Amino acid sequence: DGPFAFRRKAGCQYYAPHLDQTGNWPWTSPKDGGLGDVRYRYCLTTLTVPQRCIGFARRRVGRGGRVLLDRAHSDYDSVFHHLDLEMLSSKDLSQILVNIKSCRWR
Amino acid sequence: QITLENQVHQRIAELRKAGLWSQRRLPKLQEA
Amino acid sequence: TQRIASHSHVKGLGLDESGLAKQAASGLVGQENAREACGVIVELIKSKKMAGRAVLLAGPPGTGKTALALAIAQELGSKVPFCPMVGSEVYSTEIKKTEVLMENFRRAIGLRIKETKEVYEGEVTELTPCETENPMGGYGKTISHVIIGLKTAKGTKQLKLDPSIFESLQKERVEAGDVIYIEANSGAVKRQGRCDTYATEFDLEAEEYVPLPKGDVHKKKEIIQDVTLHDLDVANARPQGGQDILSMMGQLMKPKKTEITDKLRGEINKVVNKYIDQGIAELVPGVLFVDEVHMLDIECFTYLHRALESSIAPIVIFASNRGNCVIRGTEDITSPHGIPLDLLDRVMIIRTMLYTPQEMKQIIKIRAQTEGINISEEALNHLGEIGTKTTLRYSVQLLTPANLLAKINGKDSIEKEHVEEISELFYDAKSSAKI
Amino acid sequence: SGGVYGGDEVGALVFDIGSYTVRAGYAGEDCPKVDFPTAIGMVYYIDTNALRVPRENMEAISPLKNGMVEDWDSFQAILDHTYKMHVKSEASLHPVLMSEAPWNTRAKREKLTELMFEHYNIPAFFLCKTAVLTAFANGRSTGLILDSGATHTTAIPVHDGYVLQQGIVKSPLAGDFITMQCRELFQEMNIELVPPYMIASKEAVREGSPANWKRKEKLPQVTRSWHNYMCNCVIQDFQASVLQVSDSTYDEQVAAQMPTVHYEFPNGYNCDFGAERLKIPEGLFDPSNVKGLSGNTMLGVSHVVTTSVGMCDIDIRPGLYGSVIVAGGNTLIQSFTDRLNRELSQKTPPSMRLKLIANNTTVERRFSSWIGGSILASLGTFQQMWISKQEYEEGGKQCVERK
Amino acid sequence: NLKTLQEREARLRLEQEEAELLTYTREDAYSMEYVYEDVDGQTEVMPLWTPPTPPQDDSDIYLDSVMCLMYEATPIPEAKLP
Amino acid sequence: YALLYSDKKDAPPLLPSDTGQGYRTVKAKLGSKKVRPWKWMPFTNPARKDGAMFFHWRRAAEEGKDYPFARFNKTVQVPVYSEQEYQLYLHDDAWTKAETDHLFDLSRRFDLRFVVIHDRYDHQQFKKRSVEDLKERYYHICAKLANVRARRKEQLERLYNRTPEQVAEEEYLLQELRKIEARKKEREKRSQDLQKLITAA
Numbered sequence A: 001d002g003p004f005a006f007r008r009k010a011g012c013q014y015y016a017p018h019l020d021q022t023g024n025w026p027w028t029s030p031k032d033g034g035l036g037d038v039r040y041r042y043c044l045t046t047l048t049v050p051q052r053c054i055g056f057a058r059r060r061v062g063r064g065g066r067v068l069l070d071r072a073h074s075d076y077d078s079v080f081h082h083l084d085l086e087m088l089s090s091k092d093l094s095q096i097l098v099n100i101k102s103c104r105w106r
Numbered sequence B: 001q002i003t004l005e006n007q008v009h010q011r012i013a014e015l016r017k018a019g020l021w022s023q024r025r026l027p028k029l030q031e032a
Numbered sequence C: 001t002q003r004i005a006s007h008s009h010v011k012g013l014g015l016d017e018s019g020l021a022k023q024a025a026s027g028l029v030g031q032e033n034a035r036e037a038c039g040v041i042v043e044l045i046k047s048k049k050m051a052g053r054a055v056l057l058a059g060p061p062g063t064g065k066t067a068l069a070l071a072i073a074q075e076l077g078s079k080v081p082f083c084p085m086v087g088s089e090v091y092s093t094e095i096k097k098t099e100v101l102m103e104n105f106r107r108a109i110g111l112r113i114k115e116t117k118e119v120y121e122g123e124v125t126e127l128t129p130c131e132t133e134n135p136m137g138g139y140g141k142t143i144s145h146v147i148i149g150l151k152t153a154k155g156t157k158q159l160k161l162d163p164s165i166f167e168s169l170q171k172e173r174v175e176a177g178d179v180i181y182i183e184a185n186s187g188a189v190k191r192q193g194r195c196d197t198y199a200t201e202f203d204l205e206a207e208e209y210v211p212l213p214k215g216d217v218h219k220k221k222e223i224i225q226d227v228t229l230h231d232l233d234v235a236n237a238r239p240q241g242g243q244d245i246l247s248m249m250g251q252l253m254k255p256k257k258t259e260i261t262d263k264l265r266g267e268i269n270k271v272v273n274k275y276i277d278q279g280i281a282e283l284v285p286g287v288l289f290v291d292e293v294h295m296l297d298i299e300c301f302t303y304l305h306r307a308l309e310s311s312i313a314p315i316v317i318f319a320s321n322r323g324n325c326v327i328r329g330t331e332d333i334t335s336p337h338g339i340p341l342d343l344l345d346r347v348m349i350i351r352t353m354l355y356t357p358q359e360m361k362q363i364i365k366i367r368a369q370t371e372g373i374n375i376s377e378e379a380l381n382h383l384g385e386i387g388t389k390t391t392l393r394y395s396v397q398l399l400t401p402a403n404l405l406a407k408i409n410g411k412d413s414i415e416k417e418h419v420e421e422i423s424e425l426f427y428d429a430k431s432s433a434k435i
Numbered sequence D: 001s002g003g004v005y006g007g008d009e010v011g012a013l014v015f016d017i018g019s020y021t022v023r024a025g026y027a028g029e030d031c032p033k034v035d036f037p038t039a040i041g042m043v044y045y046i047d048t049n050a051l052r053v054p055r056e057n058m059e060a061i062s063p064l065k066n067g068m069v070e071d072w073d074s075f076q077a078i079l080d081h082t083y084k085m086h087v088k089s090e091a092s093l094h095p096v097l098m099s100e101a102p103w104n105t106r107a108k109r110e111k112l113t114e115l116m117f118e119h120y121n122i123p124a125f126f127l128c129k130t131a132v133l134t135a136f137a138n139g140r141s142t143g144l145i146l147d148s149g150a151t152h153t154t155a156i157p158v159h160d161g162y163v164l165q166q167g168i169v170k171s172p173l174a175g176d177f178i179t180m181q182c183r184e185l186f187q188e189m190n191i192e193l194v195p196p197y198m199i200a201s202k203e204a205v206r207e208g209s210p211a212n213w214k215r216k217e218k219l220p221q222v223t224r225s226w227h228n229y230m231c232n233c234v235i236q237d238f239q240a241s242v243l244q245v246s247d248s249t250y251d252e253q254v255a256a257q258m259p260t261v262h263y264e265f266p267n268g269y270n271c272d273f274g275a276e277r278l279k280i281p282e283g284l285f286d287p288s289n290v291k292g293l294s295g296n297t298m299l300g301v302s303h304v305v306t307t308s309v310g311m312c313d314i315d316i317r318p319g320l321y322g323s324v325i326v327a328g329g330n331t332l333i334q335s336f337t338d339r340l341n342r343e344l345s346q347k348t349p350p351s352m353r354l355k356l357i358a359n360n361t362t363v364e365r366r367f368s369s370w371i372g373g374s375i376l377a378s379l380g381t382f383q384q385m386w387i388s389k390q391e392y393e394e395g396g397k398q399c400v401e402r403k
Numbered sequence E: 001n002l003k004t005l006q007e008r009e010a011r012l013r014l015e016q017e018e019a020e021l022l023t024y025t026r027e028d029a030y031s032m033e034y035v036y037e038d039v040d041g042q043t044e045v046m047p048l049w050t051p052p053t054p055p056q057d058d059s060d061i062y063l064d065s066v067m068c069l070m071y072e073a074t075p076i077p078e079a080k081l082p
Numbered sequence F: 001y002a003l004l005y006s007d008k009k010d011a012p013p014l015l016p017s018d019t020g021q022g023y024r025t026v027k028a029k030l031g032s033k034k035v036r037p038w039k040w041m042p043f044t045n046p047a048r049k050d051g052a053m054f055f056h057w058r059r060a061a062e063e064g065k066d067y068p069f070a071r072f073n074k075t076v077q078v079p080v081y082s083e084q085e086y087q088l089y090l091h092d093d094a095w096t097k098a099e100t101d102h103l104f105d106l107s108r109r110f111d112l113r114f115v116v117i118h119d120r121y122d123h124q125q126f127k128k129r130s131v132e133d134l135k136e137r138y139y140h141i142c143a144k145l146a147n148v149r150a151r152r153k154e155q156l157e158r159l160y161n162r163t164p165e166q167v168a169e170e171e172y173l174l175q176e177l178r179k180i181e182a183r184k185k186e187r188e189k190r191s192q193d194l195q196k197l198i199t200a201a
């Protein structure tokens, strides 16, 4: 159908395009973007000395060898503070639906 | 039957003018 | 330690979805009609609609009456209580027979009691915001509220409690830096101890430092406690608290198990019903498996066929092994199964036929499997043949000794020679009768 | 984890030179500690204070014309004054990471390198583009650096950290146009007056009534260009204070019904512009009916961006549209970023992701170039790209092949 | 008293709007690792964003992420004809 | 909802730093130790390719350790052919020796970034060339060099099919793009109808 046809081929490999959903750089979510690299992922975690869930966060190394812990905001930032009752073991099922209980221990 | 056939016909006729089509028929990228 | 018991292979009646019986019925084989009756009665128990109903597992020896009893018990599950009892246990030198029977009936009945308590805890930071004197009266110095700064591991939350509790605070050694156990309604303060953060390694003391509480200050602790009615009876029977009960000579004789009907029934039943209909507890009637029922005296059957008439009596599973025999305590009064003809009319008889030689082989094989020892085809056939000759229980007992003989002889599987040697080293009573 | 591969900080005095305001500061810092006007009070006085004291002539001149340094003497004077006063650091003690526009000529670049390596004898040097730094400031290797400086608007695209020189679109629309239009509007409705530079004292004035004040008897300052600069100061103050960009096609039905806003001139003259305060920021996006040049043919901001995208290969446009980088002073105007986003969305072809980086909240957009320069300098791998004194004294002095 | 309670609640609210937490407790969190278990009980390690590591060989092929905006990968099978 | 993905930062977030509190608690913890002297010492990076030397903050205990990041300077594998090699093998009519040398210089400088090469390509000294053309030329030269020294077939026709079609698509007018979307929705409806038919059979 027209000159633009895939009939042409040789001794090489071709990359296939993804349709119906245009992707973005690795620092975008796979659900909305594409090929979302985990290196840029903000996940729920629990601190060591405190016993409160600070919400979504990601470990990152900063200048001088010091490691930082960035954070994000979502779901009012309040439901996660109460999510500690789900990680230690509506506002009760929501804590189980918004996440897959993939909160970081210690 | 009475109308679906005409719709399918006018869709197939207007499907691809000369190859350009957003849903499919995209030349695959070359590796490097 | 697995500690395999005599007959642990039984895991349940193993009835199909339709309620019929199969061979591989979760460990137990054969006994189709008996296992179907067991399923019917366990469905009855689960219904929890009828009370004071008894069933008799009549059958010749070796029919696995106790086996199917433990099977139905396991099927019921650990949720509902299951009190096993033998007729000999009824004979007590300190407590009469009928009262022991009633205590067993009570034990067979379960009761789950829930308890929810809203309590606040955390490191206290006491502070009293000065307030103008009572506005209804004159002037001076008063306190309208008392703020307590409970600090928990998750954070801090100040509570503006009622000022009347200040007496409790001063009563106990509630100083800034210790963990207190507050109660929502009662309000009583119970200091748990100082925080471990201040427990310097050089301070010599114990039971005084406790770790910080984990979680929010406000905690709604929900706890459930399952105790049989007999437990409540015993708890309300003996006293507690002062009254010179600390004496040794005139009080150490704790076995006062003697019990009266007034306390057993009446008040206890009423408080149980109050907790039930109020939402504080849920009644859980269990089962009372009474094997060797023929061993009971007529004074026991005459009380059984009256206690079964009560609405609170639980389900009883009698298992008589003897046949037509004189009732104990009676003068040559022969009755079927050693049970008075009057009680047999109140029990459903579940007959258990003898195991087919094929069923004997299946039982021997599954017992060997449970034991964890492999047996050859010839050895298994010889075991089945000898179990057909003599009592079946003799064959199952020849597995472990034959297994050890094989292991000591350098071989793993039990060969026919091993069982043949054990049959001559050990034999049954039928052969021992040749005196 | 010792973090040996974290980064390095070795001098690298970033000097982001700009047409409205020059910026400077050490590398590794997040905000430039030096920010003063670029125009010098050429009789040379270059400072926020020295450039506001009356003297004999004090003619104002900007060394950078069209973003390109032309008066090397004034540029050297600015650099020397900046160093001596603000930095107090010896020239040949720390490297320099000055920035340049994407349209810097080869001869001018060589002359800048020569001035850096001859009169200052700095230990090292590196001249990166402004769009590259603006992209690094946002951690973007690909995107459209929509520069909106005081003299040019250019949607420069970058590919893998390299600027696409053929994709730049030097639109004349810039801050200077807004300032000229505001001056014209004022002259139409009132008389533009000098800031307190000459006003001795003000008095209370009724909104809309003529103001009264006392004139100072200081020098006359015959140089009108200096008066023009002092007036442009107040014009820019007005622009950044009350001037707001429209959010639609700017029909003459909604603007007459929006709330009113006030503003006080240096002499105390109070006037309201709630009716036409959004008329001036229209040629930026729709340069079709501007009163200044009614018969002109220019391209708005969205048009400039679309052209810059189209003039480049299509293989990179997906990374250009999705990473638009807004920068420069004009953008801080209220509703500017929102209007730009709306226009690009309605203009950009659907099915292509368009995302505007959320950086308008702060005023750091102007300093984006300096931030990117400091970031690049703080890198360890970049420590080898510096043009050392040995590479220059060797005889090559060729920054084209090295940059 | 009602007005005092209202103003105290307002004051406390203002305090919560500045910053909840600001420290990380380097004592243990700095060196300790993080791990979680999903609903299926599977384990995974917390990936910390470190700077680019030194390449010891010719691995880490150039990916050209900006090209992945429209392409995902290259399958093995093709049309296999002129 | 689901977990978040962000490169730099979100609107209201905030990150916690390390602890330096409770000096009394950790008084003896850090009082029983000292600090390793840090010196503003000069360092020479071997990747400089020259004799220049800069400074850096390092401890006095490792006065050596020339440079950690020096091992990141990995040059791209670009063949370096001689004049005779070009005259014998890489001779061409449309191209010339100077043009091929300029192409290879740009490739070595920009690390095989053909887009940036074409961008900075000198269209004055040499007539206009296309990205696909530069790629074809480079890959052909590399293949010829690898063969004579003793990787995959390059098809300029493919690039000739991909870029113009994708451009024509990107240039879809609003009305025709909406019509294409409507036709896509109609094809989806036809597919759903076919699914219903095959399921009902």
Ligand SMILES: Nc1ncnc2c1ncn2[C@@H]1O[C@H](COP(=O)(O)OP(=O)(O)O)[C@@H](O)[C@H]1O
Binding pocket: C006, C007, C008, C009, C027, C028, C029, C030, C031, C060, C061, C062, C063, C064, C065, C066, C067, C068, C321, C362, C363, C366, C367, C393, C396
């Ligand atoms: N159907 C069966 N399947 C497997 N084992 C059985 C079966 N019936 C009886 N047994 C075995 O018989 C032994 C004892 O049976 P038991 O219940 O004591 O009967 P009784 O009490 O009449 O002697 C148990 O160790 C059990 O292993």
Ligand SMILES: Nc1ncnc2c1ncn2[C@@H]1O[C@H](COP(=O)(O)OP(=O)(O)O)[C@@H](O)[C@H]1O
Binding pocket: D017, D018, D019, D020, D021, D064, D066, D067, D130, D147, D148, D149, D150, D151, D175, D236, D237, D239, D240, D328, D329, D330, D331, D332, D333, D366, D367
């Ligand atoms: N040649 C240039 N290159 C890059 N940026 C420039 C250039 N000239 C001016 N700028 C930037 O443009 C801005 C113009 O300021 P302006 O828009 O008048 O401020 P505002 O509108 O916020 O009051 C300056 O902050 C300056 O950083």
